[PDB]
Amino acid sequence: MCPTPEAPEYACCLHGMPTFMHWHRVYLLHFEESMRRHGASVAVPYWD
């Protein structure tokens, strides 16, 4: 689903380009924003 539903005939995440980072930044944030909505007192941890 990408521009413009239901026309595509496409795939919707941004790889691989400079804005890759950017996109996924947003993505993670979205996730976080939903997670707290169900009572998350914790931000998404990172695994090293």
- Find the distance separating the first CA and the last CA of the chain, reported in whole Å: 32
30 vs 35: CA distance, rounded Å:
9
| Resolution to one decimal, Å | 5.1
* Cis geometry, peptide bond prior to residue 6 (ω within 30 degrees of 0): yes
Residue 27 · residue 14 · CB < 8 Å:
no
Lookup: tokens for 40: 């998350």
- What helix, strand, coil percent values describe the chain, rounded to 5? 40, 0, 60
